[PDB]
CSV table of N, CA and C in Angstrom, one decimal:
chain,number,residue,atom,x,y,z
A,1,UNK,N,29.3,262.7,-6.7
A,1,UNK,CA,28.6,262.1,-7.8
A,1,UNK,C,27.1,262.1,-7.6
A,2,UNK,N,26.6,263.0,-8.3
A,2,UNK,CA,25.3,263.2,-8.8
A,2,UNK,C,24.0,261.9,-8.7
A,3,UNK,N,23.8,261.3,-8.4
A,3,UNK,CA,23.2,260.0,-9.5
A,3,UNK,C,23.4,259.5,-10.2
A,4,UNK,N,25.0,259.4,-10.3
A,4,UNK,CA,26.0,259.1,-11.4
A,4,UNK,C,26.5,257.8,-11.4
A,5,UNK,N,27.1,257.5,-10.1
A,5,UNK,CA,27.7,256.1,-10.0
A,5,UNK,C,27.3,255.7,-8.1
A,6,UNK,N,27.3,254.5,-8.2
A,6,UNK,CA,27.0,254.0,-6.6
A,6,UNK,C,28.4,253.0,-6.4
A,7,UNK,N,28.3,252.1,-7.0
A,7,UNK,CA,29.7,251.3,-6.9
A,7,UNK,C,30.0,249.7,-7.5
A,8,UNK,N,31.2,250.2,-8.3
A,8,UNK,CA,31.2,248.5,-9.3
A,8,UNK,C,32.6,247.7,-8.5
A,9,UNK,N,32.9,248.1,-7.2
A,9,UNK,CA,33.7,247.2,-6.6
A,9,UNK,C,33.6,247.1,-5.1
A,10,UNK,N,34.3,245.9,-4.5
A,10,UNK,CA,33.8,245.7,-3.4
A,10,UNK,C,32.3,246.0,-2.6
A,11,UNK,N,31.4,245.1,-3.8
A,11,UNK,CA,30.3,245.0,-3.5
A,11,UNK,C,29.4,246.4,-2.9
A,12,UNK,N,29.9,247.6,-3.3
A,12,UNK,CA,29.4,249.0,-2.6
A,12,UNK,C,28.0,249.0,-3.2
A,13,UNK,N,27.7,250.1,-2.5
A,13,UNK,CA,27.9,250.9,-0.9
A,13,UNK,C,27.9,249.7,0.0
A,14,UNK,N,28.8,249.7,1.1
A,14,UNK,CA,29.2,248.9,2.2
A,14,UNK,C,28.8,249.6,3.5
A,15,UNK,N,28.4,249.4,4.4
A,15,UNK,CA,27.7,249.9,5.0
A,15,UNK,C,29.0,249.9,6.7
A,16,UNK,N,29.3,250.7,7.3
A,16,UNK,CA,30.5,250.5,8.1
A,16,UNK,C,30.1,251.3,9.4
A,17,UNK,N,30.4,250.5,10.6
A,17,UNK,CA,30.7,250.9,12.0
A,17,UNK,C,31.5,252.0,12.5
A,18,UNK,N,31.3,253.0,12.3
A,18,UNK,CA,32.9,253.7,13.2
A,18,UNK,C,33.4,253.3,14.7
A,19,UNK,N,34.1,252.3,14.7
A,19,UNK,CA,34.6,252.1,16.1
A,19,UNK,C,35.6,252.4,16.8
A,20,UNK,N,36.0,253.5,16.4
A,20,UNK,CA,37.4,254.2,16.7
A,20,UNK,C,36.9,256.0,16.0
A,21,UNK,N,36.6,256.6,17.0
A,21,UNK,CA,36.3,258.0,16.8
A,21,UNK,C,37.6,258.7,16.2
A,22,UNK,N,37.5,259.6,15.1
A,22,UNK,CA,38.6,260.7,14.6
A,22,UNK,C,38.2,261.9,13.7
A,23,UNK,N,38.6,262.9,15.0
A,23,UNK,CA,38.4,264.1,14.5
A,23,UNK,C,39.6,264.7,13.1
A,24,UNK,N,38.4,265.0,12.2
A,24,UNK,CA,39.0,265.8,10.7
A,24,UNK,C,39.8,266.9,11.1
A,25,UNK,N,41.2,266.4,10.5
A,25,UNK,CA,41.9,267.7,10.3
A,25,UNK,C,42.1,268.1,9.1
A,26,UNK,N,42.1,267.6,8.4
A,26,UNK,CA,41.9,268.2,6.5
A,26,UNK,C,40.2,268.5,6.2
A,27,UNK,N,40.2,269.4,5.7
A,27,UNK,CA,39.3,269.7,4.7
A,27,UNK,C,38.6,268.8,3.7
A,28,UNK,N,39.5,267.5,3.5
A,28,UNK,CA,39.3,266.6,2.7
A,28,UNK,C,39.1,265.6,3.5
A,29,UNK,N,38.9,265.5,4.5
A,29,UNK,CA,38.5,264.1,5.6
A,29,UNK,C,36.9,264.9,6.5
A,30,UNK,N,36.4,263.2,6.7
A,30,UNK,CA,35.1,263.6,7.5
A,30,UNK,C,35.7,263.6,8.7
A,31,UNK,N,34.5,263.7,9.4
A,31,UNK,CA,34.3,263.8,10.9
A,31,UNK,C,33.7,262.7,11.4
A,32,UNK,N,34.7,261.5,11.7
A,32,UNK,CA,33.8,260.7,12.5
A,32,UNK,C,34.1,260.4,13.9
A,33,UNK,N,32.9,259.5,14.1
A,33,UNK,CA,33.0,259.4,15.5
A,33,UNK,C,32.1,258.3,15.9
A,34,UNK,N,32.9,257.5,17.7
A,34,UNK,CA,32.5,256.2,17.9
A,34,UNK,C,30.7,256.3,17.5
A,35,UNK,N,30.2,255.2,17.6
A,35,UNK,CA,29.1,255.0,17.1
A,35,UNK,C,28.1,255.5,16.5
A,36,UNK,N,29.1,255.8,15.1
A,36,UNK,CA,28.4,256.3,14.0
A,36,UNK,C,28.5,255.6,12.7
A,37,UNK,N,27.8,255.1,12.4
A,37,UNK,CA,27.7,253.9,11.2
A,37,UNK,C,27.4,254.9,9.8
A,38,UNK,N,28.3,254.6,9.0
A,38,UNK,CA,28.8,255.8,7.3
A,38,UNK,C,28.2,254.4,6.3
A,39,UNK,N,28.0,255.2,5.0
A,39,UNK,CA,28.1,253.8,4.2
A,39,UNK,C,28.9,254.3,2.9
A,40,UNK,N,29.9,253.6,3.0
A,40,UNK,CA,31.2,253.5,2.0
A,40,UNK,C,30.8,253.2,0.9
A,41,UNK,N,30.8,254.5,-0.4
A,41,UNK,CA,30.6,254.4,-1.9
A,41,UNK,C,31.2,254.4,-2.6
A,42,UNK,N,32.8,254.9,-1.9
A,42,UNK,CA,33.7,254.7,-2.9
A,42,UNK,C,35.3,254.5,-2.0
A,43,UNK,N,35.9,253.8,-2.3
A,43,UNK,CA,37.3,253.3,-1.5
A,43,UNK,C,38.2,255.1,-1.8
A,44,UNK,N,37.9,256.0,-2.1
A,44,UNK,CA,38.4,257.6,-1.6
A,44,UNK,C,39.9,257.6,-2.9
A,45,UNK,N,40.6,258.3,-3.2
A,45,UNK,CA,41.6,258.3,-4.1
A,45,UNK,C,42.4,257.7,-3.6
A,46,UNK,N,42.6,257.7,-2.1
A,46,UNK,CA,43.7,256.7,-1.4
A,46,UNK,C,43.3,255.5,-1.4
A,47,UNK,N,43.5,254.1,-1.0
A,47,UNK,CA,43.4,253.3,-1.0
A,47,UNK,C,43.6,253.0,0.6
A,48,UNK,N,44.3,253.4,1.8
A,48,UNK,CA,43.7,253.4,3.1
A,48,UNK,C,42.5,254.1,3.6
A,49,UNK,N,42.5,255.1,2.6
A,49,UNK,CA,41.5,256.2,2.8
A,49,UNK,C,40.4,255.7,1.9
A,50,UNK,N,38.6,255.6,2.4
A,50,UNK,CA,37.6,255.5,1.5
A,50,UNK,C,36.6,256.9,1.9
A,51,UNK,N,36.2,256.3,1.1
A,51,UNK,CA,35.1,258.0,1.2
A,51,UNK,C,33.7,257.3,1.3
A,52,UNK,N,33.2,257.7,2.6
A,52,UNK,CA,32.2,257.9,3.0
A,52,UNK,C,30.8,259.2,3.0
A,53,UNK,N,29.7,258.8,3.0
A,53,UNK,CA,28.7,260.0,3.4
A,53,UNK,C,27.8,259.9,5.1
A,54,UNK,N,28.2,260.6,6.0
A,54,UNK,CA,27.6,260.6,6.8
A,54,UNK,C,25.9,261.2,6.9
A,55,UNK,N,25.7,260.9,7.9
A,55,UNK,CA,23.6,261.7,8.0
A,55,UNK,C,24.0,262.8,7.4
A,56,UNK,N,25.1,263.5,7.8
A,56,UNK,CA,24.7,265.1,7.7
A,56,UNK,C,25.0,265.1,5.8
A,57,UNK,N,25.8,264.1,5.3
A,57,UNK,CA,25.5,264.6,4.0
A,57,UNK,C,26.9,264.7,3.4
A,58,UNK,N,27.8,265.1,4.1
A,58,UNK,CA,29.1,264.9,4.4
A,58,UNK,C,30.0,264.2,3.9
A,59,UNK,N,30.6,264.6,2.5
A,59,UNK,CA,31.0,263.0,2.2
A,59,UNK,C,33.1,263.4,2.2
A,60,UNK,N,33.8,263.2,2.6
A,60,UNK,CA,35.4,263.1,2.6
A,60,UNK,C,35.8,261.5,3.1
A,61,UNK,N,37.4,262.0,3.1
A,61,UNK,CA,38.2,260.6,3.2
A,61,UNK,C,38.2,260.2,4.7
A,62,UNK,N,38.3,258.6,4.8
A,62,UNK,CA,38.5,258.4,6.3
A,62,UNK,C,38.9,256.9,6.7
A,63,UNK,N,39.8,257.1,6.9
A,63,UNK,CA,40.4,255.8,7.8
A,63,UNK,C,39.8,254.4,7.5
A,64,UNK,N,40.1,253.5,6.7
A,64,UNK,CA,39.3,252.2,7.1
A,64,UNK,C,39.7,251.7,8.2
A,65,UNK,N,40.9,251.2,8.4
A,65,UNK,CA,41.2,250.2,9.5
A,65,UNK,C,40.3,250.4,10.7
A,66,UNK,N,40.1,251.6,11.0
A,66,UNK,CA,39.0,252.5,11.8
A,66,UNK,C,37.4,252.0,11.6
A,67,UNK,N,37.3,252.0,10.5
A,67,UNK,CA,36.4,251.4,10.0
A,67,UNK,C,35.5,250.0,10.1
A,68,UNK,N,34.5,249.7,10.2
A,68,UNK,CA,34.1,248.3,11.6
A,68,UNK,C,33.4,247.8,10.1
A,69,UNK,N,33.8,247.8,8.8
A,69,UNK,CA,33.2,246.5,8.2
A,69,UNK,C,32.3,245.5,8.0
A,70,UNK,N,31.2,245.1,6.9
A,70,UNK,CA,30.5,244.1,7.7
A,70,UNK,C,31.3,242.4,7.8
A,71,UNK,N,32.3,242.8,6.1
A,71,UNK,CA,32.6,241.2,6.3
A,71,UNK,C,33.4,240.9,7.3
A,72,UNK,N,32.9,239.7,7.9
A,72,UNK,CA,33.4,239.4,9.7
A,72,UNK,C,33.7,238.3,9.0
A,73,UNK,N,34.5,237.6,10.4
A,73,UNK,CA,35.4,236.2,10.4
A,73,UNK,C,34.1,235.1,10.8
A,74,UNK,N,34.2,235.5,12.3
A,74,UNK,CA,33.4,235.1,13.4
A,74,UNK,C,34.4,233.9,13.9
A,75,UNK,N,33.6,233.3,15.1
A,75,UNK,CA,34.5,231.8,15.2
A,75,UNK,C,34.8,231.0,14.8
A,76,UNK,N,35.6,230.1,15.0
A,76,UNK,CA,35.9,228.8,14.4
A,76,UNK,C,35.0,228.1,14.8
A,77,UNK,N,35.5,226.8,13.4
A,77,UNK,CA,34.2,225.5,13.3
A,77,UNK,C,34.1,224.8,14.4
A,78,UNK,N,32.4,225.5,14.9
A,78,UNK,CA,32.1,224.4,16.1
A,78,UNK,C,32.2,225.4,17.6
């Protein structure tokens, strides 16, 4: 997407951790790897699968669960 659309859900682009390295084996998935922060513009056609752009420009499907999120829990009250 051109300059076209950024994102009208889940508050996107989301900005995300790769904390679990995984090398692409489709054509249609990126290449990530541990400590490489992507920022998620669109949740990908799949719905476990979102589509990120990495530095290099790179944009395919990839793993959320993999994916290090910003919305956190953190600890309990107190």
């Amino acid at each position: 997407g051109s300059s076209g659309s950024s994102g009208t859900l889940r508050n996107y682009p989301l900005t995300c951790k790769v904390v679990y390295s995984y090398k692409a084996s489709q054509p249609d998935e990126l290449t990530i790897e541990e400590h490489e922060v992507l920022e998620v513009i669109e949740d990908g056609d799949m719905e476990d699968w979102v589509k990120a752009r990495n530095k290099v420009g790179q944009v395919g499907y990839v793993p959320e669960k993999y994916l290090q999120f910003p919305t956190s829990s953190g600890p309990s009250s107190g």
